[PDB]
């Protein structure tokens, strides 16, 4: 809080010392640069905690949407909530997928991109058939199923990022 | 803190000003609405880190848990813990579950559903085979193998959910 | 802060009251167990928050890494961020796998070890085949595809852990 001195001989100084006792006591409640146990407050700085940190309301945590065809009429949609990334694989096959082969359309990213490569796996509807897509660091998508033309690939789950 | 006045004149002065700056340095350590570095404390609204918050001890979320047979013999086992619900798919299949079929014993209760259509990858015991469920924001499961009438479905990951 | 005492016919009264009101002021700025809006800050003690805490830079929770070769040339890459293990798998299968065997040339240690039976869902390079490997609590996890003496498992994904 904004104080002024006390001291000696001081004029007016009953006055100056209540409105210093106000001024500080008024920042216990609310305001100043205080964490207080209620109100809407914005905190900066590292702030590390040692004990158990119980949150009853919500958490939100940096979050950004994306999708697109990543190639072969596969559409990945991904939302991003801090160092992790929720996605879902939807669309249908519209074209020969060789296997092993990069999905050339849309690449994921960066923001959304994992620090390794990760293996999303996948099911086709319709049948028992599994995938899986690769995401590198890069973003350039790699398909892993056999050789496809056609059929409906399905799979959410989550991976890794980092910052 | 709660302060009495100080004013020219008063009664008592000395032992109001001593008074006073007890009452206020005893929430600067404990107490009153101020957080503290030590101690249990309760915290209301919104609050904003813009920087990094390190969380050394147990980050709690809340948690619950739900567990039901989906329908022919699949069990679905959630625990929700905050934004993510946690899934393990269990149990034996009991009876013909007809492709692209709605699980109709039980939903999904709406705590534990989705945004989204959630596309869940699992694998049966004993061969290659891998099929998917659907959860859609609606709990009522779909099964996108094909036909089966016997077998042990598997698969743990997540899902998301908000508010 | 540290105070001095404040009482009646005191020597140096002007001098103590301003010493105090400046020694509790600055903790409503930076230190003491007070909590501030900036600053690097350690907080120790059981925090509730009741109403929505949002992060905009970074949330950091305890974070170990380990791999290792389950068995059968399997490689299972793990990191642990809170009570979630983020996996990988990887490696070519060296040897015979036999169908529902466990993987015994390493277990995933304790304190990667889930609650309850984990169904880490993956897929084989080059067609269509899945398979799934049970991490239980024990940490001798168990491979559930069948027979196998090649090929290359991979997924990526999640499961819980707890304290």
């Known amino acids: 809080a904004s104080i002024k001195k006390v001291y000696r001989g001081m004029k007016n100084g009953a006055e100056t010392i209540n409105d210093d006792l106000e001024a500080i006591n008024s920042e216990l409640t609310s305001g100043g640069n205080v964490v207080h146990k209620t109100g809407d407050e914005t905190i900066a700085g590292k702030k590390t905690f040692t004990g158990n940190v119980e949150v009853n309301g919500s958490l939100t945590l940096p979050t950004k949407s994306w999708s697109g065809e990543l190639g072969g009429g596969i559409i990945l949609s991904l939302r991003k909530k801090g160092t992790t990334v929720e996605y879902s694989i939807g669309g249908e096959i519209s074209s020969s997928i060789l296997a092993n082969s990069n999905l050339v359309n849309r690449s994921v990213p960066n923001e959304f991109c994992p620090r390794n490569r990760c293996s999303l796996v996948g099911h086709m509807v319709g049948g028992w058939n599994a995938f899986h897509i690769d995401i590198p660091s ?22 890794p990022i980092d910052h």
């Open 138 to 159: 890069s973003g350039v998508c790699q398909w892993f199923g056999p050789t496809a033309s056609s059929g409906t690939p399905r799979g959410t789950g989550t991976y």
